Amino acid sequence: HMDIKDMKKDVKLFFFKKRIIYLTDEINKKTADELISQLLYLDNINHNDIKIYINSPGGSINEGLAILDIFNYIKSDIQTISFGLVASMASVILASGKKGKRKSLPNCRIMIHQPLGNAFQTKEILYLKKLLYHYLSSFTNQTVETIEKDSDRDYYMNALEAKQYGIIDEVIETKLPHPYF
Amino acid sequence: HMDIKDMKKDVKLFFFKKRIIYLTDEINKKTADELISQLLYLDNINHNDIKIYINSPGGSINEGLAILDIFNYIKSDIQTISFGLVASMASVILASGKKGKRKSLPNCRIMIHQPIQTKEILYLKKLLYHYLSSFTNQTVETIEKDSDRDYYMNALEAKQYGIIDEVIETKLPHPYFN
Amino acid sequence: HMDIKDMKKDVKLFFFKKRIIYLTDEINKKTADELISQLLYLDNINHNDIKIYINSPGGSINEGLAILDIFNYIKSDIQTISFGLVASMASVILASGKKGKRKSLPNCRIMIHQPLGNAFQTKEILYLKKLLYHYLSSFTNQTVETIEKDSDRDYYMNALEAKQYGIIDEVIETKLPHPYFN
Amino acid sequence: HMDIKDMKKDVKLFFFKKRIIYLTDEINKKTADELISQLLYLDNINHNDIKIYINSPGGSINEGLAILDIFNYIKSDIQTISFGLVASMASVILASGKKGKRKSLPNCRIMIHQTKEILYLKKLLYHYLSSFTNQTVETIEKDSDRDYYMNALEAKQYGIIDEVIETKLPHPYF
Amino acid sequence: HMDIKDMKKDVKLFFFKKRIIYLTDEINKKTADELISQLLYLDNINHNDIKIYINSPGGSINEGLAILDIFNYIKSDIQTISFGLVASMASVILASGKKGKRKSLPNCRIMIHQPLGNAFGIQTKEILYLKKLLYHYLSSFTNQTVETIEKDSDRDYYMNALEAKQYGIIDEVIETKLPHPYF
Amino acid sequence: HMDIKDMKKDVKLFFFKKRIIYLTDEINKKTADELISQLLYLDNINHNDIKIYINSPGGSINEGLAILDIFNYIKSDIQTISFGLVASMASVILASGKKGKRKSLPNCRIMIHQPLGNAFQTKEILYLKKLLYHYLSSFTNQTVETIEKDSDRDYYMNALEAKQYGIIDEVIETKLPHPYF
Amino acid sequence: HMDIKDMKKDVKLFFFKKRIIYLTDEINKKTADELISQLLYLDNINHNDIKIYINSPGGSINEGLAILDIFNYIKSDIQTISFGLVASMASVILASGKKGKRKSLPNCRIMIHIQTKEILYLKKLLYHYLSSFTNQTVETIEKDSDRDYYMNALEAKQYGIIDEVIETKLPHPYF
Amino acid sequence: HMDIKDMKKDVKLFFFKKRIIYLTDEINKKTADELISQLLYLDNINHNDIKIYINSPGGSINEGLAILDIFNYIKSDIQTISFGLVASMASVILASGKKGKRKSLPNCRIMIHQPIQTKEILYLKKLLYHYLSSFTNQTVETIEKDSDRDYYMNALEAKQYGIIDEVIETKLPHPYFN
Amino acid sequence: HMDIKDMKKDVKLFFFKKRIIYLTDEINKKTADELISQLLYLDNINHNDIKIYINSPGGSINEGLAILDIFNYIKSDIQTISFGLVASMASVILASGKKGKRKSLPNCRIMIHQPLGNAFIQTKEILYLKKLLYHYLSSFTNQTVETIEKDSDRDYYMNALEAKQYGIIDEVIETKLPHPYF
Amino acid sequence: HMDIKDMKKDVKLFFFKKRIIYLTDEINKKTADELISQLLYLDNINHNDIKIYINSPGGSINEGLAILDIFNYIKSDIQTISFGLVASMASVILASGKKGKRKSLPNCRIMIHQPLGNAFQTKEILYLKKLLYHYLSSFTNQTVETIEKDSDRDYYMNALEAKQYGIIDEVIETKLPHPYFN
Amino acid sequence: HMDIKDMKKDVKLFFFKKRIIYLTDEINKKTADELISQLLYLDNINHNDIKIYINSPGGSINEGLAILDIFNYIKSDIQTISFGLVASMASVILASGKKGKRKSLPNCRIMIHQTKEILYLKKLLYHYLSSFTNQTVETIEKDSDRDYYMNALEAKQYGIIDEVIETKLPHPYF
């Protein structure tokens, strides 16, 4: 069978019912609101693992830290899997997945900086970036100086580099080998 | 049971039925009107606690005070829980929650600073300070002073300030809290 | 029992079936038409009291006066409760509720003038404002001279001042006292 | 029982099934077409009275005359009731209602007001208003050129309506 | 019996099921396509008379001539009734109704020219060709000569119901409870 | 001779130096400002008559009354001559010319109402119109009721009707007779 | 010699000092005001003839009549010469020229074709003037004014709009 | 002599040289900057009286006060003459003219009513009332009261109010004055 | 000696005083008016040959015919020289030049149709003008009306040489650079 | 003697030749460039005092600091006089005038913060603000902590408060006393 | 005597005649063309030093290299002086000034920062900056990727300028 009346909304619903969520879009008020509702909704059903595919350029750091709070508030473990492009807050969210369950497909590009811009209060923007660096630091074991330096120079990592960095635990093996691994 | 057909509207509906509302947008005519209708509706069902998640930059003082009135017009207690960013009118609403049931997530950022006859805009601001004053046990002088200096507080600072009663514990410690 | 499939339309419908309407938007062609349809529909069901929550800056005096006509045309008595901000025709509609049944929440700000502007023919605009003052006069017992004077100076009233003015019968007391009341 | 699953569309439908229509919009191609369909539809169910609440600033004269043609094409009597503002073409339609069944709420305000074609239609429009009100074509012409609003009572005395619906609220000027 | 669920779609649907169609929009690609679909659909059910109310300023002559082709392609006869304003191809369609079954309400204004403009959309020679052809078809429907038709069109000639009948566009003017001041 | 370097500005200057001004445009702040400066400038040279051709739809009543004040403040007499279309404040200005010196070309259309609109404070708009009616009343000998009624009905007058009304003193005779005179 | 500084402003100025004006624009408030200024100015210098080339689609009827008055108010004769395209109010101005001195070039195209009661009054008035300028009946003027009719230079002469068709080194295919 | 080449710029220049300036536009950064420069320039030439024709709806309070300062910084006296419409900041400037030399044409309409940190907007308004108060000899209370009720005065009323010293006589009597 | 004050206006003025004009822009009201005033001005100085460089896509046919009228009105002969792109009315103007004095540069492109669009809508009038433009070109090139029209309908582009053989120009100006197809 | 042909440009020029400049516009690329050109030009003529009237909300701190550099680079001493409103870099430029020569008209409003917004790279914006505070600190004798605190709360000062703050040396007394001064 | 009849255009002209130019705008087609004409013009009068005040955010690399080509085509020495902000292409131009004659005001902020073509130009640009500063192409590459501003003194130590013009105002961080 395949009880589906819609080819978009019903497909996402199918995965949602299997505890699989997609964070494949810019992080903003609306996006973080939907994701938070969903996480809370699922954690209410049971405390089994939740899988979140991540392909986002990031966005608002405030919204990301809100998502990060919910991530660590619910009981269910969260395994993160990235693909496409992941940046800033999206990378920190990727890195906060349950240790050992943070993965990434081969061609994913991962970066610390924000490709959408520092804009989504001068001192507040800095405080949030510094804070973001601290969380990434605790998730990757890298020092804050390193994280900051790498963010300032717009450092782009491949899946393997992200793993060596400490952002993910393993690079998912595919039928297609990566030319530089 | 998993009686969900839509993944956005239906999820919110599910929480609404469990007396949980999300005030995660700007406060204006439309938004205030939806919340009050929802509050009055929930209070008509029964008088159990109503939970309100707050993530808002603020908005209309007039609409904010209308929400404040409805908060205190209904029988059910309202527990406020902030996350993300809460400012101006949204902070007062967070603080106006049931004493002892006002909470906040670790990384939330809370700001007082606020700012159409001129005489009215000031009367409303002075009135806001008084309410925030009785909610936090801070003098009106202090409130006004802190409101003029665009300053963000972390969750713990907001608690010490009297805006919330406790910081929700998380599996992730805050680098600046304990 | 929560038999709702929507969080907006259905909530308003739930209240509509309990004879409760929300006049919480600018008074214009579209809103006046909807409110009038609703009042006539409810008065067709039965003639029990109808409650109308009001939070509006007003708008078009013509449409406002049309609502006033339907208001006084139906058999059902009307209870008016204001919150937020109420002005111009909204205030008049508020003041037209059944005597003893006109209420207001503590923080409501009430005014006679039009905050959205006198622009929803000069002589006709004047004619409607003067007529509005007359109706408010008969609802509050204030003289038309007073009403107009207060309107021209953009006078804002708190709930208690509105009661003393004669616009409402009482200020609903809540769990939160007002800094300048009693 | 209030079996309406909507507060805007369903309320209008409830009245439509009770032969009640609302003409509270500018008179244009779309609204004329809609109204005409509705009138023709009701007249096809039976020929009982049809009530039309009017509150419109007017609009297309051509589309107004079509509505006028349909008013007098159906067998059902049409009773017009105005509230709010009624002007130009909308006033003629209010006036064209079944004699003796044209009413208005107390605070309603009523106003009467290619190149050779635009004038031909105005002239013709004056004649219709004339027969509806018993005022001479000259008086209509004159009163329409000076943009002037009438109150409900004045509209009755003019011959546009037959009666002013009384309400619990007396009009200060009547 | 009023089993209607809306005051717009369902009302038109109720008339459609009764072989009644409305041509109250401009004649363009979209509206011509719908009308044609509807005509072909009805004629597929049975071949009884199809009634079409017309209140249109016309539009595209190509789309107009297309509707005309469909008109004479189907077996069902078509009685046309005009009201409001009818022009160009709309007038021609009105005139192509079953002889003896072409009507018009009293206040309708009928003209030959295009009030929306001939550039409705410039291929000059083709525009002229489509108009001359339009004139010929109208000529064969009203018995007027192509010369008269063209002259009248070029001078933005507006006719009243009666003048339209005398011209040969409609067969009769429907009597109404309200007599026309100039009839 | 004909010392002219420009075919627009220099032509107006030529007339200005002969005490001839043109009020052939909408009456607004800028327009009234230029006209007032000019009148004051000329009255400073000498007190000989000033001729003002008027072809204006009017505009701001406030600005018109300002012009009207200056008109009656300078010592020089002002003869007004209209052509084209003259309305509202433009008509009042036309009518305030020195009695016996107010003229109009044959095809000029004259009206009291405003073809540009009452907009250029409800009670203030009425006060200004009422005031305008009073000035026109004193310039034409017509009553204020008449003026107001004629303004309300958008009354358009021909040159001869304007003279009978009392707005102008004479219709300038041209080589072309008017079909209705 | 040639003392012109630029090929636009100064060329028109040169012709202007020779009492030659170009009315090759649309007729509106600004255009009429300028033309009226220029006519009054030229007539103030002396009263010799003033030549006006016309190539205009027309425009405001009020401003057109204002020009008409100024035409008959000044003492100088005005010989109108059309070319390109002349329509409506511009055609009336063309025909309003001094009888016998109204001309047109070979290929010029000529065509006769805000309260309601006013716009009507102005058209009627326009017909009467055009009528007395062409000796055509008021009915004819109106009839032709409704059928968007274009006339060649010769037809305009026969109609009474112009007095003669300027001859040129190039014969007209239909003349 | 008639040394005029332009009919707009040159006419104003002629009056400027005769110490006559036209403040017939809105009061803003650009306008205030032109007037002050002009005033300082005229005062540098000599100290004879400077005449200023005023027809303005008002504008920036900050720029208005800057003009008020320059008015009182220069040695030359400034006589203000209003015509058309004068409101808000423009009325204060008219009233700030040299006592005894403040005039107005018959049909001029004068309005007090005025109305970007909120606290500042009020400080400026209160300050304006004081200045207008000393210029008119009206109490600050009266000024503020009349400013709240959008009310236009005629030339004579403005004189009785203390804004101007006299109404310029004209060959045309005002239907409501004598 | 070069006593110029600017590289644009004065350079054109220099040529103007030498009876040389540039018709290097779209033909419209403004352009026709300027060219016409210039032709009349030069013809007023004397009757010597007037040279006109042409590089225009054409434009309004009316304005073009007006220019053509002035061309044959003035007494001075006019020699046309084209370069770049010449189309529609611009081409006819090129062909109307003094027989034997119509020249063109090698790389010039010439067409009869309108590249800017036949819509510089009175249909019959537009067709009357197009047809009226053909005869004139016909008389200028000896080509028949059918040929001119046929070639105009198929947006036909000619090179300098083909233009001469067509009868639009008398000779192709020789240059230090030979054309790859001549 | 009034040898002026213009009422704007020439008035400013008359003052420029008397070593008086007007910094009365938002501080941006264009205005800073012009002011800098002017200062260098004047200091090239001679080294007498230069007077600068200031009425500006400030703008770009980079450009403002550039003006500050040129200010202190030239030999000529600079007298600064403020009126209207002065903020951010404008205030600093005001405070940088020759000690004892920094004046202000009575009604001037002076502030440290940027009324046009901190938006003329985060760390660089912070770096420039901190640097601005330092310069103002050395010009007023206030501590950098104080300056920043006052800036963060959008502190507005009247002329007298500005003098006591150390931004100006004296409040010019005019014919009109200030309601809250002495 | 101050014989300037304008306060903006004439002031610039006065300096131009004293061989002083201002490059205080974005580097684009128009500004490059203007500057190049000015440089070529001055070099044609004589070959004395030409001073160029620089305060620009940068711009077109192609137009920057053209200016660079012209800098080294003329015989006159070009002394560069920066103030305000100097970035990217504008920094290279500042650096390309005559060795020993490149200066900067105390508060100046200096920053170094088709598809295959855009990269080819950046690489080439790094080499030029390298020879001008004595920093290896690697250091330029690295320092340009991390968007970082230098103060006047740091710019000198980097090799972009030769000296920091001293003023009556000391810099708090020097």
Full DSSP string of chain C: ----S-SSHHHHHHHHTTTEEEE-S-B-HHHHHHHHHHHHHHHHH--S-EEEEEEE--B-HHHHHHHHHHHHHSSS-EEEEEEEEE-HHHHHHHHTSPTT-EEE-TT-EEESS-TT-S---HHHHHHHHHHHHHHHHHHH---HHHHHHHHHTT-EE-HHHHHHHTS-SEE---SS--TT--
Whole domain around residue G144: which residue ranges? 1-175
- Is residue E29 within a helix (H) or strand (E), and if so which, with residue range? helix E29-45
Task: Give the C-alpha separation, K87 to K64, whole Å.
Answer: 12
Can chain E be said to touch chain A, i.e. do they have 3 or more Cβ pairs within 8 angstroms?
no
Q: Is J8 exposed, middle or buried (0-12, 13-18, 19+ CB in 10 A)?
A: middle
Length of chain C: 182
Contact between F125 and C129 using a beta-carbon 8 Å cutoff: no
Q: Which residue among the candidates I47, I113, I135, I179 is catalytic per the annotation?
A: I113
Q: How far is CA E148 from the centre of its chain?
A: 20
Supply the DSSP symbol for H95.
H
Distance CA E174, CA J67 (A): 86
CB-based contacts of D3, cutoff 8 Å, min separation 6? none
Q: What angle, 0 to 180 degrees and rounded to 10, lies between the N-to-C axes of helices A61-71 and A122-140? A: 40
Q: How far is residue H156's CA from residue H176's CA, in Å, rounded to a whole number?
A: 9
Contact B175 A131 (CB under 8 A): yes
DSSP for J33-71 reads: HHHHHHHHHHHHH--S-EEEEEEE--B-HHHHHHHHHHH
- Residue D123: its chain G contacts at CB < 8 A? none
Q: How far is CA A124 from CA A129, B150, B161, J131, in A?
A: 9, 10, 19, 19
Q: Which residue has the tokens 């249909």?
A: I123
State the Cα–Cα distance between residues A96 and A91, nearest whole angstrom. 9
CB D118 to CB G116 under 8 A?
Answer: yes
Q: What residues of chain C lie within 8 A of the CB of F124, using their CB?
A: none
Which of F29, F63, F72 is closest, CB to CB, to H171? Answer: F72
Distance CA F151, CA F118 (A): 12
Provide, as residue numbers in chain E, all residues whose Cβ is less than 8 Å from the Cβ of G146.
155-156
Do C123 and F125 make contact, defined as CB atoms within 8 angstroms?
no
Handedness of CA C132, C136, C141, C146 (dihedral sign): negative
Of the candidates F68, F112, F72, the one whose C-alpha atom is nearest the C-alpha of residue F93 is F68
Q: How far apart are CA K108 and CA B175, in angstroms?
A: 37
| Gap between the Cα atoms of I112 and I147, Å rounded | 11
Query: Which tokens go with A19?
Result: 């505890």
The reply to whether residue C16 touches residue D8, judged by beta carbons under 8 angstroms, is: no
Question: Residue ranges of the alpha helices (H) in K46-101?
Answer: 61-71, 89-95
Please check whether residue H94 is in contact with residue H51, taking contact to mean a CB–CB distance below 8 angstroms.
no
Residues 6 or more apart whose CB falls under 8 angstroms from that of B20 comprise B50, B51, B52, B53
Tell me how close the Cα of G146 comes to any Cα of chain E, in angstroms.
Answer: 5
Q: For residues I139 and D88, give the distance between their C-alpha atoms in angstroms, rounded to a whole number.
A: 61
Tell if the CB–CB gap between J108 and H34 is shorter than 8 Å: no
DSSP state of A27: B
* Chain H residues lying within 8 Å of B125, measured CB to CB: 118
Q: Which two tokens stand for residue K58?
A: 């940068």
Residue K149: φ, ψ to 5°: -90, 140
| Touching pair G, I by Cβ (3+ pairs < 8 Å) | yes
User: Considering only alpha carbons, which residue of chain D is nearest residue E2?
Assistant: D17
Q: Which of H68, H73, H129 to mutate to test the interface with J (most CBs of J within 10 A)?
A: H73
Q: What does the alpha-carbon distance between residue K60 and residue K33 come to, in Å, rounded to a whole number?
A: 12
Q: Which residues does chain H have within 8 Å of residue B123's beta carbon, measured at their own beta carbons?
A: none
Task: State the Cα–Cα distance between residues I170 and I172, nearest whole angstrom.
Answer: 7
End-to-end alpha carbon distance in chain K:
39
Structure tokens, E42:
């009805």
Method underlying the structure: X-ray
Q: Chains F, D in contact: 3+ Cβ pairs under 8 A? A: yes
Q: Do J65 and K22 touch (CB under 8 A)?
A: no
What are the tokens at E139? 């000529």
Contacts of G117 (CB under 8 A, 6+ apart): D119, F156
Task: Give the gyration radius of chain E's Cα atoms.
Answer: 16
List the F156-157 sheet strands across, edge first: F85-86, F109-111, F156-157
Whole-angstrom CA distances from G111 to C155, G160, I122 are 64, 13, 12
D145 contacts on F by Cβ (under 8 Å): 153-154
* Of D1, D47, D113, D171, catalytic: D113
Could you give phi then psi for residue F17, rounded to 5 degrees? Answer: -70, -15
Q: Which of G5, G83, G175 is the best mutation test for I, with the most CBs of I within 10 A?
A: G83
Residues B58/B38, Cβ–Cβ less than 8 Å: no
What resolution does the deposited structure have, in angstroms?
Answer: 2.5
Residues of K in contact with J131 (CB under 8 A): 107, 172-173
Provide the CB-side half-sphere exposure for I104 (13 A, CA).
32
Q: Which SS3 state, helix, strand or coil, does residue I23 take?
A: strand
Label residue A141 left, alpha or beta by phi (over 0 means left) and psi (-120 to 50 means alpha).
left
What does the buried/exposed string (b/e) look like for J126-158 if buried means 16 or more CB atoms within 10 Å of the residue's CB? ebbbebbbbbbbebbebeeebbbebbebbbbbb
End-to-end CA distance of chain C: 38
Query: Active-site positions of F?
Result: 113
Compute the nearest-CA separation of B40 from chain A (Å). 22
Interface test with H, best of C145, C153, C154 (most H CBs within 10 A): C153
Which residue from A minimizes the CA distance to J125? A122
Residue among I33, I38, I65 minimizing CB distance to G24: I33
Can you name the residues that pair with K149 across neighbouring β-strands?
K111
What does the alpha-carbon distance between residue E64 and residue E57 come to, in Å, rounded to a whole number? 12
Whether F29 and G56 have beta carbons less than 8 Å apart is answered as no
Quote the number of domains for chain E: 1
H80 vs H93: CA distance, rounded Å: 8
For position H153, which CATH number holds? 3.90.226.10
Chain H residue with CA closest to C153: the answer is H149
Q: At what angle do helices F88-95 and F61-71 cross, to 10 degrees?
A: 10
Best CA proximity match to F8, nearest among I31, C142, G9, J58: G9
Q: Please, are residues J8 and H23 in contact by the beta-carbon 8 Å criterion?
A: no
